[PDB]
Design a protein around this ligand. Structure first.
Ligand SMILES: [Mg+2]
Ligand SMILES: [Mg+2]
Ligand SMILES: [Mg+2]
Ligand SMILES: [Mg+2]
Ligand SMILES: [Mg+2]
Ligand SMILES: [Mg+2]
Ligand SMILES: [Mg+2]
Ligand SMILES: [Mg+2]
Ligand SMILES: [Mg+2]
Ligand SMILES: [Mg+2]
Ligand SMILES: [Mg+2]
Ligand SMILES: [Mg+2]
Ligand SMILES: [Mg+2]
Ligand SMILES: [Mg+2]
Lengths: 70, 67, 150, 151, 117
RNA sequence: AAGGCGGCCCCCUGGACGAAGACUGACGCUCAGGUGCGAAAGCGUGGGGAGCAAACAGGAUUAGAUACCCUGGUAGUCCACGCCGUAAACGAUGUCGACUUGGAGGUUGUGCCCUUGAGGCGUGGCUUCCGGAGCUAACGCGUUAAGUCGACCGCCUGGGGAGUACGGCCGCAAGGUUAAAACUCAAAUGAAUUGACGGGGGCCCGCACAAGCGGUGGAGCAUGUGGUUUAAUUCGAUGCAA
């Protein structure tokens, strides 16, 4: 969030460091979820669905390697 | 699963220590998730409480700016 | 403004491309109620026979029963006031077994009643569904574009 | 257009001079496959404006054409009544063709003595950046900055 | 009137508009511009080009104070989070900090209900 | 136990698991009535009320829009004591016992090994995914069985009428609980299969768009169709495919 430009730094890299710091901190991603209200019911639904999909994609990717030589 | 404690045996994270505790908070005053730190489930759970105690005692900032 | 009773249900039911601002010929109580007295334009169509495109479908609430000597009725075939230049289009493209001419609105012009008329085909449910689908889909596509652009 | 990436068909060798750009210009100018009349008219206008300018014929034609060859145009890849316009920088292959098309479009706009005289004035004033093709190009270039929100 | 050496820019971008203002050191604003007040309105004013033009118009209205450094503070999610910075840099300024301030609640007040569009 | 529970600190307290140790000696499981707890919404009293938000006001789209969208906005959401006892109160799977192949984990103890790394070998408690036998109409369950049993309670007997009315009870009320009958129907159903459709997704082709070029719609001219008139304007073709 607080990105002070060091001595003798180009504007392009100075802004790139700010952008990377913002992306790592996740500021733009917090407003996109705090703009509207999400009930605990749908919050748990989304969490469970995301976990299931994350589990299934990994399992499918690991199980698809031992088939279809090329 | 206490990667940062296997060779140390601290077994108890104390909020008094800040030198080896500020490595678990990012520049914006947020705790680095255990998924990244590779910390045990109990050690990360108690380290979070220790960081909260430090923040209450004004040892660690809550946010980056904190005006 | 000067706008009087207009039929918008017909405007929705049809996709009229013809717009003629022809006038109407009326008796006394007709214009009495048209100035104030609720002449109703719902269920309007023309009845071209000779050169006599009467506005068959038109109701009216009579002002009073002052004309007691002769009994009049709201259901009268009001005549039409249109140029012979454009009356040929009605002499022609009206008999297509699926083409009609209907009245959209009725208004005033220097104390003369002018009833707009137009040639339409007629929409059956399966094309009204498509029209509503396209109308909502344009809005949805614009909303999706705005959401994607952020 | 979908799976085939076409090449390019060879143009006439331009027997008078040998300029493929001149061949493209005369091919754009000609209509109804009447090459003889169009070539005669363009050659007559060729000579008239070259002798009006004074410099070399082709060396003046190139400098008059590069002065109204556009750089960025505006297109619209949108569907529906609402449309968004995006500026696209023209490639050199299409740049000369568009310039020649604008020149021939502006040529048939004056009531002169003949088509050669119609061509000559609007072909010569392009070197000095005057006429109708330059007038429309200096507005096409402004269209790009009129609304450059998306590019 | 007065001549300030260095100041603080504030950005208040959103999904509909972008506001760029200039403060001297403490809270006293001495110049501001908006995307809606630059010709662009409705859908067009939310574009980053509108924010870039507003930033130029704000920088052109601070010449009397003669500032040279700008401690920028970016706030609000919008297209104007970088176009304003680019315009300020191109307008001849030597920025000293790129601070990002965002009013992110700590699970505080309840946000308004979601739109069922 | 369920409902449910998320900054930190203090005070009181319930419950679960493990290393080794001794006694109490069937004291064990279930449960009709009965009692207690019990999401949110709701009601009474006394307060509080920042944001959100039923009812409501205005704007907007639409033929209409008492809605979806936008600008405000009362009860409510908050606190304490009270009242109802309703939910997709869901794992649509009532409590306990033991038996019946495995793999990959998650959390939390415990014994021993050179603990040089979240090194290894065993043993417990909770829980996730895959899956063999077995079961099921199929989906699917599969050591936390929907596999084979044992003990107990509750419920089901065609879809509507209806969990409706009457009747008894509870409740300030809203309503809850126990619970039919007359009449109609030949079905009402669930898992899966092949098409078709989606304002579902992914990929591809065609002058289908995008870049052209020339025409059509404008004004006579040569044709066919519809209606008009006549005795006939003979009949057929009436979307793309007339
Ligand atoms: Mg809003
Ligand atoms: Mg305890
Ligand atoms: Mg009981
Ligand atoms: Mg409540
Ligand atoms: Mg509100
Ligand atoms: Mg509202
Ligand atoms: Mg209350
Ligand atoms: Mg129930
Ligand atoms: Mg149940
Ligand atoms: Mg029991
Ligand atoms: Mg448990
Ligand atoms: Mg299985
Ligand atoms: Mg009842
Ligand atoms: Mg659609």
């Amino acid at each position: 969030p607080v990105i002070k430009v060091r001595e003798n730094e180009p504007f392009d890299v100075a802004l790139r460091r700010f952008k990377r710091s913002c992306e790592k901190a996740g500021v733009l991603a917090e407003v996109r979820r705090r703009e509207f209200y999400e009930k605990p019911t749908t919050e748990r639904k989304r969490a469970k669905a995301s976990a299931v999909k994350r589990h299934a994609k990994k399992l499918a990717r690991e199980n698809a390697r031992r088939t279809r030589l090329y | 699963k206490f990667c940062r404690f296997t060779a140390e045996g601290v077994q108890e994270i104390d909020y008094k220590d800040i030198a080896t505790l500020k490595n678990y908070i990012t520049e914006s005053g947020k705790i680095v998730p255990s998924r990244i730190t590779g910390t045990r489930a109990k050690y990360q759970r108690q380290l979070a409480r220790a960081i909260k105690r430090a923040r209450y005692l004004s040892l660690l900032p809550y946010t980056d700016r904190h005006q | 403004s000067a706008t009087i009773a207009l039929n918008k249900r017909a405007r929705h039911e049809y996709f009229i491309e013809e717009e003629f601002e022809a006038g109407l010929a009326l008796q006394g109580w007709e214009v009495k109620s048209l100035r104030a007295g609720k002449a109703n334009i719902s269920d309007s169509y023309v009845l071209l026979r000779d050169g006599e495109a009467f506005l068959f479908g038109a109701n009216i609430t009579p002002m009073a029963v002052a004309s007691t000597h002769v009994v009049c009725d709201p259901t009268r075939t009001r005549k039409l006031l249109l140029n012979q230049r454009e009356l040929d289009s009605l002499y022609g493209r009206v008999n297509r077994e699926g083409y009609t001419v209907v009245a959209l609105s009725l208004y005033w012009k220097n104390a003369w009643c002018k009833v707009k008329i137009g040639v339409a085909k007629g929409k059956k449910q399966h094309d009204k569904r498509s029209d509503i689908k396209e109308r909502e889909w344009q809005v949805d596509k614009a909303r999706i574009m705005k959401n994607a652009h952020r | 257009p979908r799976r085939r990436v076409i090449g390019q068909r060879k143009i006439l060798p331009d027997p008078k001079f040998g300029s493929e750009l001149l061949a493209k210009f005369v091919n754009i100018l000609m209509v109804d496959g009447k090459k003889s009349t169009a070539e005669s008219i363009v050659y007559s206008a060729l000579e008239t404006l070259a002798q009006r300018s004074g410099k070399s014929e082709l060396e003046a034609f190139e400098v008059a054409l590069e002065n109204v060859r556009p750089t960025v145009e505006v297109k619209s890849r949108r569907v529906g009544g609402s449309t968004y316009q995006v500026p696209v920088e023209v490639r050199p292959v299409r740049r000369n063709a568009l310039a020649m098309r604008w020149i021939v479009e502006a040529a048939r706009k004056r009531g002169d003595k003949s088509m050669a005289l119609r061509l000559a004035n609007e072909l010569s004033d392009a070197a000095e950046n005057k006429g109708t093709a330059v007038k429309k190009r200096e507005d096409v270039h402004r269209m790009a900055e009129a609304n450059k929100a998306f590019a | 009137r007065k001549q300030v050496s260095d100041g603080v820019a504030h950005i208040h971008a959103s999904f509909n508009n972008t506001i760029v203002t200039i403060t001297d050191r403490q809270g006293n604003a001495l110049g501001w511009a908006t995307a809606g007040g630059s010709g662009f309105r409705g859908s067009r004013k939310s574009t980053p080009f509108a924010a870039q033009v507003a930033a130029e118009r704000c920088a052109d209205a601070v010449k009397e104070y003669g500032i040279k450094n700008l401690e920028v503070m970016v706030k609000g999610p919008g297209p104007g989070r970088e176009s304003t910075i680019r315009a300020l840099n191109a307008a001849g300024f030597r920025i000293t900090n790129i601070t990002d301030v965002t009013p992110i609640p700590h699970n505080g007040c309840r946000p308004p209900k979601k739109r069922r569009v």
